[PDB]
Design a binder for this molecule. Structure first.
Ligand SMILES: CNC[C@@H]1COc2ccccc2O1
Ligand SMILES: CNC[C@@H]1COc2ccccc2O1
Lengths: 268, 269
């Protein structure tokens, strides 16, 4: 991978691996989410930011400030097959004092056609107290020189799925997967649960029949709270409809919300 | 990746990814096990075998026969760091009518030094009944033309760790991780639990303090039975020993049916 000619975006090619594909011989949504995260890390490295998953500046380091994901939105038109090359282009944009946005475009390296797109909203917080805060001028000046100044949106449409409000699932849930625990493979270098594990946990309550007859087209996921290594999760799903589902991840004990989301599936 | 000059082995380079590393900023043993499996699959593709993880042939496919892992042995000297390039060389050898063996050599692409090695024993089995069988001559003739004829061992030593007998852990276990279930990310294209998930499940009963102060040097794992998508696993560990040795057991949460047994060797950082 490498930054583009203007240094305002980053590109990388990936060949789909044997263990990365599902029961349809194509990449799973978790493999896709992992590749977006890898190209995002490589973009942060290429311009001097931290690489621990927090894209930290020298100013953020002294103040114990980290970038955290608040929302992830992924739309896939074609899942690459095993052995295929997928090219991902990624860039960042400042959203004033609200936070930052990372966008992605996925293409077939052979045909050049757009096979998917993603958007994510990041927010600034203290790593110790977990308190959210607005982006100050001193930290904006450090990352704005790596962002295009004119808006460049992966989801430009007025009233698109990426900015829709998500409701809280009502009990009883139609479907559920109870007792989900992270293992060491689910943790990052900082011993925190990887953001991709939550996507897998959300999809665990979708019945196998839906997975077998449909393909996942859109997934929107809000991140409310982190799941600790010793926490236990319950995954809840309800059909709201193409098939649409409303999702909720909550702690197995107290029922504390960690994530909420929506999925859209198409018939094969 | 590509087959070497003589077409009797396969090589591939991999750059270590951000999400593939652990708390030490180096590749986990599960990332290593995944890469060995990927290079093994690419070697099977390059010579016309099936790619579903079973390296079949038209003859095995006719009789519903698949290759299944009976033992995996991995020894790591240096875990590659994130951003480093690791080169893996893999080859197969026939073990007469017992089955096949797949060996691996891991090297630092920059220095050329051996940073790890692995060996695996595979056995012929009917897909449907799960019954093992000795390799027939018709099958042997199909894969021998892709194997070196003279022995080429990743673990040549006379009384080495890869061929040691593993005992069954006695109750009570010193350590345990109960209620382990596979999710969809743990399944392969054939909807079977990936062999790498069992390695992760074995390591879950090792205390976090051991992981934090030691590095995994050797892991030997026997595969007795397959874990279904709806099965629940219990991981059991007992210290048998600067070096720490453990005895492992994976069994079904209900009936206590054995699925795996193994050993690990760790050294102080
Ligand atoms: C959380 N993602 C945005 C931060 C700040 O701005 C960045 C600009 C370029 C590369 C990485 C960047 O990381
Ligand atoms: C179970 N693994 C060995 C089988 C048979 O012999 C092979 C030779 C070369 C590549 C793949 C091979 O697959």
């Amino acid at each position: 991978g490498s930054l583009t000619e203007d240094g305002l975006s980053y590109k990388e090619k990936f060949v789909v691996r044997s263990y990365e594909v599902g029961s349809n011989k194509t990449a799973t949504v978790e493999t896709i989410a992992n590749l977006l995260q890898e190209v995002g890390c490589n973009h942060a490295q290429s311009v001097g930011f931290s690489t621990d998953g927090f894209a930290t500046t020298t100013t953020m380091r002294k103040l114990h400030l980290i970038w955290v994901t608040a929302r992830m939105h992924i739309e896939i038109y074609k899942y690459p097959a095993w052995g295929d090359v997928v090219e991902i282009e990624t860039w960042c944009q400042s959203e004033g004092r609200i936070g930052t946005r990372r966008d992605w475009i996925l293409k077939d390296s052979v045909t050049g056609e757009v096979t998917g797109r993603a958007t994510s909203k990041w927010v600034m917080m203290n790593q110790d107290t977990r308190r959210l805060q607005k982006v100050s001028d001193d930290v904006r000046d450090e990352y704005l020189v790596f962002c295009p100044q004119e808006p460049r949106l992966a989801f430009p449409e007025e009233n698109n799925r990426s900015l829709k409000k998500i409701p809280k699932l009502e009990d009883p849930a139609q479907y559920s997967m109870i007792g989900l625990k992270p293992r060491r493979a689910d943790l990052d270098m900082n011993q925190h649960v990887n953001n991709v594990t939550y996507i897998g946990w959300v999809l665990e309550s979708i019945p196998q029949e839906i997975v077998d007859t449909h393909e996942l087209q859109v997934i929107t996921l809000d991140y409310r709270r982190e799941c600790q290594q010793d926490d236990v999760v319950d995954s809840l799903t309800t059909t709201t409809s193409d098939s649409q589902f409303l999702h909720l991840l909550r702690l197995s004990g107290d029922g504390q919300e960690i994530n909420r989301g929506t999925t859209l599936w198409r018939k094969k």
